[PDB]
Ligand binder design. Structure first.
Ligand SMILES: O=c1c(-c2ccc(O)cc2)coc2cc(O)cc(O)c12
Ligand SMILES: O=c1c(-c2ccc(O)cc2)coc2cc(O)cc(O)c12
Lengths: 230, 230
């Protein structure tokens, strides 16, 4: 029970943060974004396994959550990396793209603008480091409704409730009024729907891409998940 | 300021609820769903105009919110209508479909299952009538980030904050602990991302449909919005 205690949970999530990922480049923008995502997924899996209680979930729930959440978690990390730089998306060290470079690939400008506007909202709310760590973990745990709708099910609700309690604790430490605490929790959680919207649009765009101009991220992810079951 | 007061706001939303809509039927499932949506949009516009402060927003914000939110608001009303009936989707009086009827149209079963699982989550949480009225209005107001990221912008934040305060008031009246209040607010708002996910999948499916087997809902909606500007 103390591993899921707020201060301790926050500090555990801080140490599970993924490393810096480089594209390390030797049709090009899409190849770079998909190659980058495949490299980051490796570390996302590692991060998930470090969230207190995640590996105590059934294997079925662990895999369903990872397969559903990947673009959302990737995009939430992108938004945190780009928070202090209006008009820029810091995909990686590295791979810094300006909004206007989205004009070169059909369908991408729309996705860049949604990403930049969501990032702007988190900048305006002055998202804290401790709040970002809770939110990103909530994105993985709230990704698939199925796992919630028995032993493993009880557990997922409990785990999502503990991260939420941590977020509530972080907001209370800010010293603001009870009304303002309630409002800040609502403003942050309403933004989760905008991160989900971006991920859905990104996935739709990727699925509409011609196979030759892209790394097959999803199939590579499934191989990773099979590789981690065996 | 008292029009946006919690008890009064809830009671105003209750009276702005749309009427029952019938398909009134004289390739068929998709025609029925799209004909139904076009009829409901007429009343959705009317409902929006009755939410305190909505018509005080700039015309640009009113139209952007309506164009972005339509499938989400339609689907949240569907989920409320179907809440007490596992395995059934009560699209309208009527037009009651069983989960298995989704098997007949390609791509629809996936959307029916997401709708039925989200509906199941709201049933498990025992969503109250007063909570549903606040949530549906929050779905319209949180639909587009753009309008938030000056006079009309200030206003949208204020309006979204008032509905949120109403929801917080409703949850507090339930008598549960402060921790439980925080947790219930989080559980409901996290479900908004699942309603957004369903709407995105529904829109993608509709856009992939062959024009002859569907009513052109979106173009009809734009005509309604132009018809209401003029
Ligand atoms: O944003 C992305 C990303 C992406 C990559 C790394 C990140 O950290 C975040 C997103 C990957 O593939 C795409 C593929 C697409 O077709 C469209 C997209 O917007 C993306
Ligand atoms: O669910 C819907 C609805 C719909 C209709 C009425 C409602 O109250 C809610 C959703 C309309 O068009 C679609 C069109 C689609 O291609 C797929 C869908 O799932 C839908």
């Amino acid at each position: 029970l103390d591993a899921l205690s707020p201060e301790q949970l926050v500090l555990t999530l801080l140490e599970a943060e993924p490393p810096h990922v480089l594209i390390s480049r030797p049709a090009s923008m899409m190849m770079s974004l998909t190659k980058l995502a495949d490299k980051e997924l490796v570390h996302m899996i590692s991060w998930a396994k470090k969230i207190p209680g995640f590996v105590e979930l059934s294997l079925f729930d662990q895999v369903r959550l990872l397969e559903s959440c990947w673009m959302e978690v990737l995009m939430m990390g992108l938004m945190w990396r780009s928070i202090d730089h209006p008009g820029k998306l810091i995909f990686a060290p590295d791979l810094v793209l300006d909004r206007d470079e989205g004009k070169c690939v059909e369908g991408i400008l729309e996705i860049f603008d949604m990403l930049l506007a969501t990032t702007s909202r988190f900048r305006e709310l002055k998202l804290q480091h401790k709040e970002y760590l809770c939110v990103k973990a909530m994105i993985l745990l709230n990704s698939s409704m199925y796992p919630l709708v028995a032993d493993s099910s009880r557990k997922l609700a409990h785990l999502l409730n503990a991260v939420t309690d941590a977020l509530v604790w972080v907001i209370a430490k800010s010293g603001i009024s009870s009304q303002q605490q309630s409002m800040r929790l609502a403003n942050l959680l309403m933004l989760l729907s905008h991160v989900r919207h971006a991920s859905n649009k990104g996935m739709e765009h990727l699925l509409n891409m011609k196979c030759k101009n892209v790394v097959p991220v999803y199939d590579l992810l499934l191989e990773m998940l099979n590789a981690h079951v065996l």
